[PDB]
Every structure is written in structure tokens, then in C-alpha cells.
Design a protein around this nucleic acid. Sequence first.
RNA 1: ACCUCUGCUUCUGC
RNA 2: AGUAGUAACAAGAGGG
Lengths: 737, 731, 482
Amino acid sequence: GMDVNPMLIFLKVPVQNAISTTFPYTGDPPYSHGTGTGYTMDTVIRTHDYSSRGIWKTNSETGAQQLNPIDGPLPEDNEPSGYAQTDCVLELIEGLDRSHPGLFETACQETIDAIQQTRVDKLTQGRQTYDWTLNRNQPAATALANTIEVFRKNGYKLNESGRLIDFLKDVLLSFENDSMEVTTHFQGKKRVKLTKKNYLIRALTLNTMTKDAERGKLKRRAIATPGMQIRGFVYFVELLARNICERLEQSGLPVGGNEKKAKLANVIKKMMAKSTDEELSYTITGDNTKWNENQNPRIFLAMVLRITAGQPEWFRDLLAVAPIMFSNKVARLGRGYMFESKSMHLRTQISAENLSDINLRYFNEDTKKKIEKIRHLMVEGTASLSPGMMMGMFNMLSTVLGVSVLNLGQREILKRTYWWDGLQSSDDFALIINGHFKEDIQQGVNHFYRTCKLVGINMSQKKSYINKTGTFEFTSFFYRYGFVANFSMELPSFGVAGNNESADMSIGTTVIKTNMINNDLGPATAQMAIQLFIKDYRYTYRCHRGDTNLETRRTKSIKRLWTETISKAGLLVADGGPNPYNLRNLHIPEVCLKWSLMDPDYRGRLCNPNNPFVHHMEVESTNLAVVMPAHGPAKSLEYDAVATTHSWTPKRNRSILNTNQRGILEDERIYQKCCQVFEKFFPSSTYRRPIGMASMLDAMLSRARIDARIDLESGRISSQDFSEITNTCKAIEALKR
Amino acid sequence: SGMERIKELMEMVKNSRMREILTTTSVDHMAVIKKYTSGRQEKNPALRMKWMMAMKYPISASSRIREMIPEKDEDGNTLWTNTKDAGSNRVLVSPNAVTWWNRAGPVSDVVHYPRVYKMYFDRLERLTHGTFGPVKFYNQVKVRKRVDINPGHKDLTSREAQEVIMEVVFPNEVGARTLSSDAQLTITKEKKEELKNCKISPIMVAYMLERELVRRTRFLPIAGATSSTYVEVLHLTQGTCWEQQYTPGGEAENDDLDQTLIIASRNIVRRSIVAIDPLASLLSMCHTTSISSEPLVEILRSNPTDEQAVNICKAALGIRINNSFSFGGYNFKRVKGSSQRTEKAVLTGNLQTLTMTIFEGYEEFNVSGKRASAVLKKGAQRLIQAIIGGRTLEDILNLMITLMVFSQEEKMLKAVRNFVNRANQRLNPMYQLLRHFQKDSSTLLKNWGTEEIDPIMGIAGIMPDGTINKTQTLMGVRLSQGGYSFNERIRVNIDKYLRVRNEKGELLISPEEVSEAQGQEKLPINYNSSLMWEVNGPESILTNTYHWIIKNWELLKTQWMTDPTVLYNRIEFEPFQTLIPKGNRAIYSGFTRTLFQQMRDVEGTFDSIQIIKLLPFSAHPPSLGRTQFSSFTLNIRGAPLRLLIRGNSQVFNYNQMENVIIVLGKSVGSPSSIESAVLRGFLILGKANSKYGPVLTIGELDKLGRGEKANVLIGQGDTVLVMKRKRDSSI
Amino acid sequence: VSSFKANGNIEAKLGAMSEKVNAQIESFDPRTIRELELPEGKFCTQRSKFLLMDAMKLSVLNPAHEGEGIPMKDAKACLDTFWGWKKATIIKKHEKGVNTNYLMIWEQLLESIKEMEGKFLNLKKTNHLKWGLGEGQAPEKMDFEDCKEVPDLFQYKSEPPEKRKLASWIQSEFNKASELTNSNWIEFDELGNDVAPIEHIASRRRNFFTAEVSQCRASEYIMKAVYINTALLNSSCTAMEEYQVIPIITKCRDTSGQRRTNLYGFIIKGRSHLRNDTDVVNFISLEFSLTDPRNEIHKWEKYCVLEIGDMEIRTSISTIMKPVYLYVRTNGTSKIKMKWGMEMRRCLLQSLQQVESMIEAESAVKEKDMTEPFFRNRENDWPIGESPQGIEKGTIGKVCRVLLAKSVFNSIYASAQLEGFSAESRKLLLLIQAFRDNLDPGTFDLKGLYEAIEECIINDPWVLLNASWFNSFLKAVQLSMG
RNA sequence: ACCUCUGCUUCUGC
RNA sequence: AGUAGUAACAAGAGGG
Ligand SMILES: CN1CN([C@@H]2O[C@H](COP(=O)(O)OP(=O)(O)OP(=O)(O)O)[C@@H](O)[C@H]2O)c2nc(N)[nH]c(=O)c21
Ligand SMILES: [Mg+2]
């Protein structure tokens, strides 16, 4: 009667060396269903509770109730606290300035240069963005377009320069307007005038939603998305902080996996060298609890002013904007709630805005208590949220704060029987504390921990632990006298990526290859991963080998291609061909690998540049996929592939056809039309964005004229063309009139 | 032509909306509206594709597909529809359309494909003509380094590649700025020629040209050769416990070969200095070593590299040497005098401590060059005076700057406007101070000074400018002419200890001058030698030595008991000696052998782990010493690691739970309260005792007496009861 | 801020801050810590989408018949191998269902199969089938203004899950999952030819791997999952209004080498207008078994089990009639669950990567490939189980199958309970490791860590088993220490 | 009872 | 009923 228990393997195998078995990433991760309104309310409440002993004010412009815990009473227990102290923060930042002579000045000068150079279109980069013009989320570029358009209609157009800073100027100046005008589509189109207050509340709004597909957690949590007014200001603050973090050896940001690992190793090595043989050394595997909910905009305002000391006032004030806006932020409360009647078999949606005055009879006890606490914070359908940093976004700048505490631990500063150093990456850290005896270690850990509390950093006492230096964890990297592999973290990336036939083949082989190099994917398993990938690709894309008797919508066409091909080894897998891959050729694009084996006609069709399937847009987004790792944010992935008829694009979602927002599809179609024809005059604009104040039309007319002339006096074109063009140009010229 | 595009435009401008857009959207603002979309980045593309590939028409294609292929195929499949994709004029089509086209569509010619996609096709060529050696199994530390990932680049910056690609693919859209460099121009010519008449999308051409032209890098765990042609196949050549010997097809860069030759020569020199007969040992290794299966001897015969270690090897082999070194692409030959290496700290203009070596002494330097030459004088961080000549004023510029940098003066130190990369890896100091003052002399020249040179109607001058002046110049800078016999290779001789002298008997090179920097070869070095571990590298010296001890432990143990001094002198421990600082080898040996004798003397206090740990440190004629050691320093890649005498360290620890010795994180297998081999002339008895007085440091055990037991802070926070032994152990 | 200069600011406030603000370290000794507490309640019940150990197949050796490959044609050929049919009766009630409806669905299905022509089968929307598939069960949607006054209008039930406690069946299923069958379940697609020596080395190791894994019962489930989820996603997408029948098929090969098609039962897909990735498709599963549920009813709470026939067993000194049951169930899944089920082959990679890393680590120190030694010199060198005597050890082959089964069960029983349990218990594992490495581990709030683990153990059978396994590990480690 | 549209689009940040 | 699990699905929207 033997019962199998896979955990018993750890009797013999050190946990880190079989750590892969503790990561269940072959199953579907948890998803939220329905509203995030409950989590949002939760967060708003918690953030206020942790700062509750501060001062309340009513904001003159928004009327929002605003809690200020800064320089409040000192923490009295180990609960998460927001009572950060300005003078303590400034001491740490000054200590960091001292430790890095000239670093702040340089990082500032690089930011000034960037401010001058940065184009409005930088803001086209980003994901879902709250769009105050629609009071809805939109893609970043669309949100940018909408803000620009509504601005110009209301008389703000410094951004016509094309420089980002001029758009920022427009943003601040927009807040003076008596009555910002937008247009709704009634449930059609209609002019709406926002009160100065309405507009300002929208400008300061974070949209909120719940985070799906996060691993390692029983319960769901809320996240937030800021709008366009703040985004450009955040851009520059974080650029400044990034410039600094890059020169901090204790910063985990912004370096990636291998480099993060190198830097951790370095810091152990550094530390160990700097210690004496008689010192103990311990490592805290450290997590901060309620990071987002306990950092404070007012503190980041202090950090920015201090970091930029001595700099031009225009730049300082520019950088200070983001913190100020965050101090004055509000959260949208989400989609609301669904209600149901058993007796009457019906169900209904209420809005988050409804929560201001809806009868409370409909709600469970928990939710009703939430609404009651939230009500005092509500303003024009939003909840005031002065404390905290719900949306995050100051990753780099909060990292600077954490590092500043690490930097305090130098022996010449402390002059104690202990000292410390380590690495910081947002709300993960590793702390290395040294001293002569265990009681020095405890004291040093208390010093570090209490200092953290004085600046609103709260070490999770449940998630953190301590041991003698030698082993530790940091962001699911496991160190046992050197980093070990964690193959299971990467398991979700083994599959068909779902970009297209061409991209997916290259992504699939590259994933195997990078895991062989980086995550100790053994060669036997790597071979099996090829076989399993090929099978999944064939089933997904219905591109089973041409000699197989599976029935799909594709099989008859692929069989013809098969029977008509001489060199079958030349056929791409997506064309019913065999798999050519083994370990040695994983880095070779399929098309290259089979090039010499292809029937010339097949190759010639496959690679016909005239084909109507490939969708090229821009050099800078070519051969790029977005992948979502198991942990952390979505990432651009470069792949190597020859553009062929397999480099196609799946269809767009069509749900918008049934909505008020369906007009947008037509506007999109027009703009693309305009941009495509523009590119026929200026091919180079798919590589490097063109610059100019000239209209698109004037630019194209001047190009056509000069091109027709050189065409003529090169021989390429006849006179009875050169006439037709220059004539057509003059008609366009007049029709423009 | 330009015929149909203008007709289209005409057409569009007839429409009022489009005319408004085209007239009121600047070129700048086009960047915004180009990305205007209702479509969002798919958050779960894997799921979505699985869902959509079940559908009849999941693919979106240009509407012109409808005139290009049949609506239905021979089998009745609809291939396209007229449904517009949301937000465009593309239409919804079946995957059957893709296959149709691939069997029955318009055939194109593919002459440009190999050329446009050369970066990719080259990979296949290198593999098709690669050669496989065998697989070996061993544990090797793979250290994470930034490495090159794309062979065949042109080492352009992103600016210079952009400029080149604009000239090649879109010449009329270049704008004002056109190409400086001759490198840019010659690339432009070639590419223009190779890609003329090319009908592949200029998007792909530009994308490929950019990938191919710019040196790109990546941070990777890499144990062997770091050249890009090796990085490219790292997945194939390197595993956790194995190496697949392999040689890519095609030629190595001369730069990679030169770099590897220097690394090989240094390794050979450093290994040889610790042998009883250095010259014999160096010659042996020279004669067995190969780089990519080329004999080192042939390389040394035909390679012009002038470097100290390289020149020692050349001397040994009867090859004539140029007694010069290169710095910043210019060959330097010291005429008279000499100087001294000194490690000292330096506050730069950035406000930065950066403590690398200085040269301190009188040194006349003749400096040859591409198009220039000069007669630099140098004291201690001094430019005593540099007279420079060349074809162009330009060629006098490069070298002008190089020489101010090379001087090490305070006026260039306190004139810069970090010392590590982001991974916090130390960088080349007296090469980076050049790189900086390269693209920005400005501060240097206006912080250098000037001088009022006499009429002496011959010696011109250069100003804080680049300008030429009559009887002024920079501080110690001149512009004259002069400078065949600089390049002449001389016959030298070399003694048993690697000292190189000319035929007149004058000392040219000594092994101690050889740079101590432990680099990483770009190409594979095989020493093929009994004097070198099969697995290269300093980390591997550590793991291999301890692995070897452990696996031979039965023999080595009885040798330890019966015949110590033969064990100490074994040749397998000589590589390890190269990791021990020269100045510590003897004292460390003395300490170790004494501890081992105490272990022998005090019976029943045997400890195999302690013996294994300390054994390599025995391998040097011992010196007498009072000093007690709590650790021994090893130098691994420029960084001291300390191995603790008592118990476990990060470098060497025994793990009870696995029952293995772990060395720099790698298992190398496994083999009373009284500790006999930790302090010389003391025993550790066990836990400290307050009933034997207060706690002394180690360096205060000084004045105890036979039998007299103390409490000691012995290491890593422990306090123990020691006793000064009654008898002694001698060596 | 511009004029600020620091002067003891941190030191002053540290000296004003309560000593209750501290990070006191508590020494961590696994010998004096308690086991995890599991929840109490009713016994946990089965929640796989298909039967595991209790499944029964009708199969055809070397299928030839008209339309080999066409699922329904294969299903009829498998059905035709069975002669023991008999009027269906209910023997184990779904207490909360209309047990009559399930009987009638079976009869309807059998009849419709009997009479089908074509390659697909869509069932009539009878009242019994509409009930089973939750037709019309969604409340009618209305504007709030039009129903705000209804007395019982209320927030959707949004409460912690009901707790359930461990039962023995889940460990029993796990044991079976890690066992060898005499069928090869996995057929792999081709590689390019081996050319590099390391490729040849890898293929030898790979063949040992498959020879442990392809015959493992866990691998049968993989193939069941991949087939069921693929067919249900394709059908979900293309036949949204149809009650489509999906036969549950796998194909294997004997150790003799002969092909075999296997029919386990059928699925009836409900309507499938799946929009959000969590949106549910209801389905009915009807699966053959020789297991009598009445012996372990807590395992089968959601099922209605029918008796549908008899199976002749014949040692030709006796012949005995074995009841054939049909396990019938309403169930549901989503696009997100179907997608992951389609990818369950990745479980092979999680197991074999770990096994391979163990072979490689030993190879490094032995300076040679330890594959053949590991797979051939079957010493019991890995603790993988426990009997009443004590810890039992197995070969690397056993390890491969146990790790595969763990991975496969993680996929079948994916949950937020498992996610949080896994992450939090991992810290406790690492603390034990730190003690055994002599690294003097300490905690800041061990009590909090225990609660963080324990709140994740609610009602999921796999999580309850994994919690049990952690405790057994803790006890084993404790026994090996004090 | 019919007809039509929709299957990521009022909800996925850094 | 069932899926699920702190809130949802168990078709939605529009026309007639
Ligand atoms: C600044 N230099 C450079 N140099 C010689 O030129 C050699 C090459 O310069 P380098 O760029 O530092 O290279 P190298 O030292 O080989 O680099 P590494 O040892 O880090 O691999 C030096 O090792 C040194 O012998 C000098 N020699 C003398 N006498 N005086 C000097 O001021 C200088
Ligand atoms: Mg956190």
C-alpha cells in the first residue's frame, strides 16, 4: 500500500534544484469574472486606512476630500503605514547625491535634452488609456488623437509645433477653460459642455479594472490606467529616474533577467570582499506589503524637487507636474454591479456612478459597508484618492527611494556594529546585513526596517525571511551559491503564439533555443519540445503534412500542393511540408533552411512581394510580436523570418459595429487611406517618421512635381505623362480652392 | 512613372473629408493619425488564433485579392469574400486562399532574396560548412557577459546606419546631412549595387539592412569563445554538463584572432612562470596549442601583433619582434628611459574615484601610424612635449588627442564631462578616457592651456582649436615633420625565466610586465597540454583542481600521510598557484604545511575536508611566518575571493544535506571537538568559555603560553576555546 | 527642499518611534513547527471534465471500416464491438438534478446515433436535453429603472466557496496516474535527422524518456484532454446554436505495435455563444465505467449513473456478467480552460526537463553521460512515496512518471487555490531547505505565513492532497532529524 | 414568431 | 441543474 508523494523528492534533492516542480504553470491561471468595482473600492478604503491618522482637506478646484499622512504621527505598530516623513526622505536622497557626485546633474541634463527632442507622437506608445473625451478606455494613439482634436477645437494648439513639451503646455493651459466642449453620440451626435470642474476631474482620473491571469495568488486585485493629461509628464519623470537607476548598482531596474542576475552576483561579491572574515552575513529575501497603497505623491514631489536641485526652474516645475497630478487624482469605480431576481428570473446592470445614491438594500453586507465608506470620497462619479499610488507608474522613482535606504547602510555612514547593502526592484528587494554577532544582525535589520517605515516602505513580515548569505530568492530567481534555473516559469511560452504562420514558426524554435541557453532546457527535452510544437502548430493552423488523412477545411488544397510538388522537403510546414528542425538549426529561419530544396515556382509564389496577404506597416514594428510572460508585463519579441504569404494578419473584432462608436471605423479607414497614398510619395516614411509643418497634401503635390521632372529628364517618363501629372497636380491645386 | 498615384490622389481630394484631412494634417501630425485605431493589441493571441482558425474566414487580405485569385477553388472552397475587415478596405478570406496562391498564384523571381536576407542566409552557410568535434562532459561555470550576437555587422552606430540606409533605399529623402565616413560611402556603393532593381518591400530591405549593419549585443551565460559566430550556436555547443566541440564554416575576423592570440599568449606566460623551467614549459605549450585548430606556432610566425606576452612567445620561438605595443590604433616604441606601474585613485572631471594604474618615470616615445607620427615625451602623468606629423591636419588630430589621453595628466583627468557598465563590470579606463575625448575635445583643449613657442622657424603649433599658429601652441604640443626603421623586427634572445634581451644583452621584456588581466577568448583555444586543464578559465582552475583532488583522494591521502612533500610539489597544483597573489604564495604554503603537520602530530584530529580545501595552497616553497590567516585570497577575473581557513565560504563549502563539496556553486563530488589545522601553534577545543577570560582577536593570541586556553573570535561570528600547544610542529 | 540640509533627521525620528515598530526575527526550526491545517466540511468530490481511473473503453484493433478517422464513424465501430446492451436504469442519483432527464438524454443519444447519416450529429432540442444543457437558464436582462422595485432584486451571491475536506479517492487517482499501462499513448511528429554528436546523445536519452512516459496512464489523460478540448473549442466556435455530439476518442498502439481506436463515451455540447474568455459552454458527458459508484458516492456527487448493459468475463472455467455503468453529468468549460487543455502536452516538458537536469547534474561530476546507467541500473535512488512501513524509493523511470502525473494533475485541477497554495508553501519549503543547509533561518511572521498558505486550502481535491503531501514531507524531514 | 448584427471592444495599467 | 467563486456565465444587442 504505497502512496506516491512527489514532495518526498525534496528529502534528497535541494529545494532550489527541483524548484520547477513547485510552479503549476501547465494549467490555466485565475481570471476575474464580472466587475472590478469591489476590488477598486477595497483598495481605495485600504489606502485611506493606512493613512487615516493624517489631515483631511477639501480641494479648492475639485471639491475632493484629500487625506495627507505626510509628516503625520509616526507609525505605532507593524501594520502598513503611509506616514512617510519629508525630512527623512530628503536625508536619504541627499545621502544618495553625496554617494554619486554629479549623477543627479547628468541625469537631469539628459532629461532636458530629451524634453527638447521629444515629439508628440511618443505618446502613441502605450496600451489601454483612459480617454477623458469619451469617459472610456482607448488605445494610446487614439486617446492622444482625441485629446489633440478636442484641444484644438477649444483653442489649445501649441502642440501644432509637433513637440511633446508644447502639448504639455496645452494640457496645463486647458485647465483654465471655463467650459471644455466635447461631443457625445446620444442613445447621432451632440455637443456637451463640461464645467471647469467636470473637465479637471476627468483630467485627473484613473480608470480601474481587475488584473486577470496573475499567478501565485488566491484573490484578484484591481489595477488602474491614467489618461492623456498625465501620461506625458509621467514619461519625463520616469526618464529622469531611469537615467539615475541605470547608474545605481543596487537597482534591479531597468536591466532584464541575465543582467539582473549578473548585478545580484556582483553585489554579493562586492559585499563579501568588503567584509572582514569575522563578520556574519545574512540575506533577507524581501517583499514590500502594500507598496502601491503606501507610497505618496507628496513624497515623490519632494524627491523630484531635491533631485533637480540647482536646475532651471522651468524643468523642475515640468517634472513636478506628475506628482502634483497624482496628489489630486481620482479613481473611476469600474463597471458597477449586476443584480438578479430569483422570483422574477431577471438580471440588471447598475453603474459605479449609481453607487452615490442607489438604495443600499440590494447589496450584501460587505459591499454595503464599502459603499458607505466610499460615499464621503465620491465626486462626480469618482472616488477621491490623494494618498497612495494605485496606478504605480513611478517604478523607477520608487526604486530610487528603496535604493536610497540601501545606500544608508554603508559602514562609514552608520558607524554601528552592523552594516548593509543589497538590490532593489520596486517592491522586491534582497538585503545583505553583516555584523560581528547575531544581535548586531537583528539590530541592523530593525534599523533598516524602521528607516523604511519612516519613508512609507512597509516590509511584508509574512512574505519575507532571513538566512545566512548563500541562498536567497529575488523575483522568482533562485540562488543557491549561484543562480539556478527555473524552467517552469517559462512553460506558458511553449506553444503556438498566435501571430501568424510565419511568425509563429520562428517564435516557437527561438523559444526552445533561448531556454536551452538560459533556463537549462536539456537537449533531449528540447528535441521533444520541437516535436510537440510542430504538432500544435499543425493542428492550430490545419497544416498537417500533405501525406496525411486528417479532414479539415484545408486538407484538400494542401494535398493538391503536395501531389503537385516535386521537392516535398522544400515545402514549409504551413504548406503541408515536413519538419526540418533539430537542435543544431533552431536559429535558422524556416524559409532559409528549405530555400535550396524548394521547387522554384513554389518559392516564387511563396515569396512573391506582390502578394495580398502580408501587412507591412513600419520598419520599427517589423518582425515584432507581443508576448505575455507568466509573470510581469507584456513584452516585445523580436523574431527572424522572411516575409511571405504566411505573414498574414488575422481579422479584427467587429463588436463595435453594434455600438455608438461604430463611426470610428470609418474615420480609421479614411486616415489609413490618406497615410497609404502619402507613403506612395514618401516611401522613407515607413522607416523614419517624416517631419514637417506642411500639410500632407502640399507635401505630396511638391513631391509629384519634382518626381515627374526628374522622371522626364532621366528618360523614365514621356512628355505626355509629364503633362498629365503636372496637370493633375494643378487640378488638385484648384480643387483645393 | 508616378502616374497612378497622382490619379488616386486626385480621386481622394474630390472627397471633402479626405481633402480636409489632407489639408489640415501636418506631416508631423500624420504620425498620430496613422496609429488612430479602434483595434486593440490582442491580450491573449494564442487563444484568439485557436478560436479564429476554426472559422471560415479568419484572415484579412487586400481587396485586390479579389481580382488576383478565383472566388472558389477546384474543390468548391470559397477563397475570399467581400466582407470588409473592421476599420479597413481589406477583405475576409480563407486560409485556402494562402495555399491556392502558393500552388497556383503568380510566380516571382527571387534573385534579391539571398542578398536582402543575407544576415539570415549567412547563418545557414556557417552551419552547412561547420565541423563537429566530440561531446565532452564536465561542470563549467558559465559567466553572464554582454556579447555580440550578429556576425557580419559593420560596427556602425544607429545614427550612421540610418544615414546609410537612407542613402541606399531612399536617397532623395535624405535631407541636408550627407555621409562623412569612407566606411559609410563604400558600404553605400556596395549595397546600392547588390540591391539595384530590387522589388522586395523597402520596409524589409531597410529592416534587414538595419539588423545587419548595427552591432547588437546580449547578456548570456557563456563559458567558451565569445565571438558572434560562436554565440550564434551557443544552444548547440554548450549545455549544463556538456560541450559540443564545433567550428563554424567561414573565416574568423583578424580582430578576433588577434585578441585570442593575446589571451593565449598571456595564459601561457602566466602558467609558465610558476613552473620549474618557465621557458621549457612555455615552448611546450606554444608547440601544442591551437586556435580554431590552427597551430599557435604558425599564428605567431605570421601575425603582426606586438604585445608583451605575444613577444615573449615569439622570442622563445626565434621569431623576430617589433618591441612595441599598440594603443588607440597607433604603434608605440619607447626610445629612452622607463617607468613604473602604480595603483592609485583618481578624481576625474565627472567627480569620480576610479583607481586604475599609472605610469611613473621618464619615457621617450616614437609613435608610428596610419597617416601620422609623433615624438611624445612622458614623465609621471606628464606630456613633456608631443611633436606630431602627418599627411592631413586631420591625421595629426586623432593622434594629437590620443597622446593627451595617453599622458595620464591631471588636466585630462579633471576635464571629463562612470567606470563600470550597468552590470557593474569594470571597464577599460585609459581606453574610455580616449573614447570620450574623441567626440568632444572642447573641454580638454581649453583646459590644457597654450604656449608661446619661439620663432625657431620650423616648429609650428596647434591651438585650443585645431587652428595652426605661428609662435603659439598648446601646452607642449608641436607641429613638425619627420618620424620604415620603426617597423624593423629585431632578433632577440630569451632566458630560462622569460626575460627578453636584444643581441646586445639589453632587457626588452620581463614576464612581470605582462598584463594581469584575465580576458575571455573570442575564439576557442586548445592548449592540448599536460600543463593546462582541459577546461579553460580561472573558475575552472578552481573547480577542476578540487574535483581532481576529490576523485584521486585515496592515493592523495596516503601520499599526504607517508610522503607529504612529494604531494605538495605535484604538478597538478601549479595552475591553481596562478590564482594566488604572487606575494602570498610562500606564506600561504608555510601556514598550510604547518597546519597539516599539526594535524599529523595531534592524533585523531584528521579532517579530509580541511585537507582537500587547503591542499593546493601547499604548492610553493614555504616561508617562515608568524602571521595567522583567517582566509586565503584568490584572484578570479580581477576580483578577490577569500577562502576561509575555518569552515565554509562562498568559494568552498561542504553541504551536509547533499554531502557534496560545492566550489563557486558547482558540485565537485565528495570524499572530537578538536581542530588541529586552523591556527598555527594552537588547537581549537570547542565552545568558548567565560570561565577562561574575555574574547581575544586572532592577532592578540600573540602572547599566550603553552597550555594556556583563551576565547577567540575565530571567524564568522563564532567564539571558541583555543589552547596554545605545548610542543611545536616544524616544516 | 532647495535649501534643505540633513542633520540627524532620521536618527531623531527613529528615537521617537515606538519599539512596537520592529522586525524581530524568530529562529526557524522545522522540528518544532506544526503541520498545515486542512479545512473541514463534506468530502471533496470529482471535478475533472472526463473520467480518470474509472474510465472504460470500447475499442477496435487495427480499425479499417469505412471512414477510419471520421470520429462518429470510429465511434459506431467501437459501439458495434459491444453486445451487452439492456434497458437503462438509474442506480446512483444526482441528488440535485432531475434524474429522469439524464436517462432520457442517453436513450435519445443512442437512438440518434443508431439512425444518423452524415459525418456530424446534432441532437434534437428536447425538454430533457434543454434542461441538462441549461437552455434559457440565464435571467432575462432588463434596465434597472424597469426592475429597481422588485423586492428580491439582489447582488449576485459573492461569498467564499463552500469548504470540503480530503477524501482518499484523490490520492488513489494520483497513484494510478503515475503507473505504466500496456498502451503507448503519445505519438510524436518527426525531427530533422541527427547530425551533431549531441543530437545523437539527445535522441538516445529522448527514447528512454518516451519509453517511461508514453505508456504512463497520465499520458492517456493528456490525450483525452487534448482531444476533448480541441473538439469542444472547434465545435463551440462553428456550431453555436447546435447540440453537437462529440465522441470521446483516443488512439494508442500496443506494445505488440498494433493500432487501436478507443471510445470512452460521448459529450453533448450546449449552445456556445462564447464572448468573454471565461464565458461558459454547458455540456453533457456520458462515459462508460465498470466502477460501481454506490461504493464511494461522495466521489460522484454531480453525476447521475445509469446501468446500461453487461460485460461477459470468461476464464472458461467460469463466465460472469459485469454490469456496465454510464456516468452522466452536466458540466461546463470556457475558451480559456479549453485553450489550456489543448496544450496539455506541455506537461511532458515539465517532467522531462527536471529528470534531464538530474541526469545532467550527475553527468557533470562523473564526466560522462549517465543516461543509460540511470535508466538501466535500477537502484531505488529517489524517495517518491510512502507505505505503512515508511518512505519508499523509486527509479528515475518512476520519478519521470510521478512528475508527469503531478504536472498533468496541475492542469486538470488548475485553480486559484492551487496558485496561492503553491506560492506560499514554497516559502515554507525554502525555509526548511535553509535549515538543512545550516543557514540559520529566521521568520518575521511565521503565523501569518501559515494563514497565507492555509486560506488557499478550501475545497479543491488536488489542493487538499498537495497540502497533505506537504505535511507528510514535513513529518519525514522531522523524523530524519531529531 | 420572425429578421439582422456580434463572439477580446462600456472591462486588461505600468 | 451546471460551470464556477468574492462575480459572473447559464447568449447579447437591434429591428419588427
Ligand atoms: C597609457 N599607457 C599605455 N601603455 C602600455 O600600452 C599597453 C596597452 O594599453 P591598454 O589599452 O591599457 O591595453 P592592455 O593594458 O593590454 O589592456 P588589458 O591589460 O586590460 O587587457 C599597456 O598595457 C601599457 O603597457 C603605457 N606604457 C607606458 N610606458 N606609459 C603609459 O602611459 C602607457
Ligand atoms: Mg508587493
